[PDB]
Short mmCIF file of N, CA and C and ligand atoms in Angstrom, two decimals:
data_model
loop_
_atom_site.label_atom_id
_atom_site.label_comp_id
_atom_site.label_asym_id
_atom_site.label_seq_id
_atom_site.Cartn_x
_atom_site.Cartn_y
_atom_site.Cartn_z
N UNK A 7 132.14 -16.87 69.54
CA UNK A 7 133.05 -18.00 69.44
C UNK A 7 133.43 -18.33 67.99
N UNK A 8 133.17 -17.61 67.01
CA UNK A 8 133.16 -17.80 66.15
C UNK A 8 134.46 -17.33 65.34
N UNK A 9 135.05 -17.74 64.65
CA UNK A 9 136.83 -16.86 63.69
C UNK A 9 136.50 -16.34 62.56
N UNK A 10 137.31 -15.36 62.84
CA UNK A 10 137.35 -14.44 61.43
C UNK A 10 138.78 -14.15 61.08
N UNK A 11 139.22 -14.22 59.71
CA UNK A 11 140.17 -14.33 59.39
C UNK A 11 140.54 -12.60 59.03
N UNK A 12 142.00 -12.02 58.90
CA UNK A 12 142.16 -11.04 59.11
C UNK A 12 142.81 -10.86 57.71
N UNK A 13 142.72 -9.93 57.25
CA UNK A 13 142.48 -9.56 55.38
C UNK A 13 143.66 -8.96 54.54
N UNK A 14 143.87 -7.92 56.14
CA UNK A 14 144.88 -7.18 56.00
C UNK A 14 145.29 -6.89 57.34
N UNK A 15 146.84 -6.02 57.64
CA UNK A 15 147.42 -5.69 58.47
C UNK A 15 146.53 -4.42 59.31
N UNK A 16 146.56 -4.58 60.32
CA UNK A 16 145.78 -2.85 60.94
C UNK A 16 146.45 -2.72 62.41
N UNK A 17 146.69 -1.26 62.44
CA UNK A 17 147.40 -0.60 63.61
C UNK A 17 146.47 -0.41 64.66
N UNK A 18 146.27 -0.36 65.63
CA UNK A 18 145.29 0.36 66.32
C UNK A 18 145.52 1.74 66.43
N UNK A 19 144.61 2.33 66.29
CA UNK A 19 144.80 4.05 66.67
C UNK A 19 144.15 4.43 67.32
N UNK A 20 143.55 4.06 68.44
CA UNK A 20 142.91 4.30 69.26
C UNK A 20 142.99 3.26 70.78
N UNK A 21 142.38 3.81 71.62
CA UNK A 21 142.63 2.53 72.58
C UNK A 21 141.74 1.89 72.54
N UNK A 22 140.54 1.45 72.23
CA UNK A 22 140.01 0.72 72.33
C UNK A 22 139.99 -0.01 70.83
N UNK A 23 140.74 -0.08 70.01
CA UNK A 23 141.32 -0.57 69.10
C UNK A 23 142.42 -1.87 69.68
N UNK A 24 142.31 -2.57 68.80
CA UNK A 24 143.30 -3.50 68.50
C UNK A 24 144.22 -4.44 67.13
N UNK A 25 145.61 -4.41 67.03
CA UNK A 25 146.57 -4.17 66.20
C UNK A 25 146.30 -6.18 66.07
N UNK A 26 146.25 -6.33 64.54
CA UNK A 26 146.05 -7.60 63.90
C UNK A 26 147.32 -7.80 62.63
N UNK A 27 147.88 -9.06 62.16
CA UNK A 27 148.78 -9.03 61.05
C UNK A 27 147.51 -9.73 59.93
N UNK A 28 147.84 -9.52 58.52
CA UNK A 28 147.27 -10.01 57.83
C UNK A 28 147.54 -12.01 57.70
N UNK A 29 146.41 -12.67 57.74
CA UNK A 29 146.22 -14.29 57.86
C UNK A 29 146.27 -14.48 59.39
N UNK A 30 146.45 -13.43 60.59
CA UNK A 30 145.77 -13.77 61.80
C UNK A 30 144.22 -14.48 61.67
N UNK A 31 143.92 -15.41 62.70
CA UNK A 31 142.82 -16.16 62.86
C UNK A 31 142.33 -15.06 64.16
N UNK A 32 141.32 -14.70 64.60
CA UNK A 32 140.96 -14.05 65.10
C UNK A 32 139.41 -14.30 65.86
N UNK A 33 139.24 -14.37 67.16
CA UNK A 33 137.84 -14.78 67.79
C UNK A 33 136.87 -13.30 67.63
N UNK A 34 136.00 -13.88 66.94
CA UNK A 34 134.55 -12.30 66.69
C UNK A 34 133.98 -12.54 68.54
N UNK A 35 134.08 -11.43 68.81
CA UNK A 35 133.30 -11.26 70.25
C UNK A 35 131.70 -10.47 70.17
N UNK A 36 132.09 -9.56 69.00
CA UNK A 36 131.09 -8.32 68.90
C UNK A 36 130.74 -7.91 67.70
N UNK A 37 129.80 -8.57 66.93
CA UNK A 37 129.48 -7.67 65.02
C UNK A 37 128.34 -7.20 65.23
N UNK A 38 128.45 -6.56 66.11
CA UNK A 38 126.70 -6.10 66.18
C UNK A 38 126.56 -4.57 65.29
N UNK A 39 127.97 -3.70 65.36
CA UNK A 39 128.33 -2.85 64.54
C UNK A 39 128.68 -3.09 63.58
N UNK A 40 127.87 -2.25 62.26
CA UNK A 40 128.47 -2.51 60.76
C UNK A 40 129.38 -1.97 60.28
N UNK A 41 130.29 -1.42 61.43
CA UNK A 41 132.13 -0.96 60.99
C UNK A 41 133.24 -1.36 61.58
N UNK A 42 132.97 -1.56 62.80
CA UNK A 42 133.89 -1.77 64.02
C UNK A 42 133.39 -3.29 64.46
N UNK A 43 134.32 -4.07 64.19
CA UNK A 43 133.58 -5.93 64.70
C UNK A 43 135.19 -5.78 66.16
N UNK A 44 134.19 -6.61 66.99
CA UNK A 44 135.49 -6.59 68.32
C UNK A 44 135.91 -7.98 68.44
N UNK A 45 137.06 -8.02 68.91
CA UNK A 45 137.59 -9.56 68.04
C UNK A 45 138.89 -9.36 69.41
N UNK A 46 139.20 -11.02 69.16
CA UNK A 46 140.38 -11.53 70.12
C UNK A 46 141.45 -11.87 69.45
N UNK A 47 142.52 -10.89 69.31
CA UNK A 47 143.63 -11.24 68.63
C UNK A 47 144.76 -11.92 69.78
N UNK A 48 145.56 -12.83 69.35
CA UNK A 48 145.94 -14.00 70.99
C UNK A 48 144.99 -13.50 71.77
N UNK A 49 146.20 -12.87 72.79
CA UNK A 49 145.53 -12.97 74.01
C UNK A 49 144.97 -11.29 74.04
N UNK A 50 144.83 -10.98 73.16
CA UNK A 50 144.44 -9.08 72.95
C UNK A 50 143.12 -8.94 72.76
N UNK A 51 142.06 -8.11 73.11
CA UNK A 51 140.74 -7.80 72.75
C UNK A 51 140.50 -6.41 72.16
N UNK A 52 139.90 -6.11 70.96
CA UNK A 52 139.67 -4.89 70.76
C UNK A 52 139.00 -4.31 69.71
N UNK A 53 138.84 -3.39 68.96
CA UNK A 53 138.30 -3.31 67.84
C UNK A 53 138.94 -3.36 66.39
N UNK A 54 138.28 -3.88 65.08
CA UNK A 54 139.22 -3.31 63.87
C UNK A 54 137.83 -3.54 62.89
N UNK A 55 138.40 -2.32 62.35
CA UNK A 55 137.42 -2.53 60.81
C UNK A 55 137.30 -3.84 60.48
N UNK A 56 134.99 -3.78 60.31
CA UNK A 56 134.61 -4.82 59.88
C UNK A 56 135.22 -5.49 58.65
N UNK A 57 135.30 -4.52 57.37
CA UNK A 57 136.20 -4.86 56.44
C UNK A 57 137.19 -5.48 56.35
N UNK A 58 138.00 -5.38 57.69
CA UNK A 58 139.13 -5.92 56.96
C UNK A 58 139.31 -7.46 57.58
N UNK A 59 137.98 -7.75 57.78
CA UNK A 59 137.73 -9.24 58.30
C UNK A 59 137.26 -9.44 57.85
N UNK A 60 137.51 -11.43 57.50
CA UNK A 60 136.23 -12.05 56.80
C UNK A 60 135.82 -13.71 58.12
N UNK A 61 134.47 -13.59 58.10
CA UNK A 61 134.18 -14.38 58.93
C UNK A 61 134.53 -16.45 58.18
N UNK A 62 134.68 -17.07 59.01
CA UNK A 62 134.78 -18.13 58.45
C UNK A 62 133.96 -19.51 58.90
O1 LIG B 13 137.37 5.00 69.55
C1 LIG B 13 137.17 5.69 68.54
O2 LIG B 13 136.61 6.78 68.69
C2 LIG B 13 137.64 5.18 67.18
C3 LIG B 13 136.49 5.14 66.18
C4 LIG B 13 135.89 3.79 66.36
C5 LIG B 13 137.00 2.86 66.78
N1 LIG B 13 138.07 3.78 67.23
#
């Protein structure tokens, strides 16, 4: 339940990926991985580099 703010722009390239704009607010679902954090962009769920999030 927690937001993480999004750093930079990212595409998904994969399907279980998901596509974020940079200053999206974003719900953390999953940081249990130290590369891939899974996050709720609107109404979208998916993965994006831990990096290019910062938690808030
Ligand atoms: O699904 C895959 O294989 C790639 C690598 C992690 C996230 N997307």
């Amino acid at each position: 339940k927690e937001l993480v703010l999004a750093l930079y722009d990212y595409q998904e390239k994969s399907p279980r990926e998901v596509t974020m704009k940079k200053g999206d607010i974003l719900t953390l679902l999953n940081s249990t991985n130290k590369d891939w954090w899974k996050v709720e962009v609107a109404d979208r769920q998916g993965f994006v580099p831990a990096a290019y999030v910062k938690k808030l």
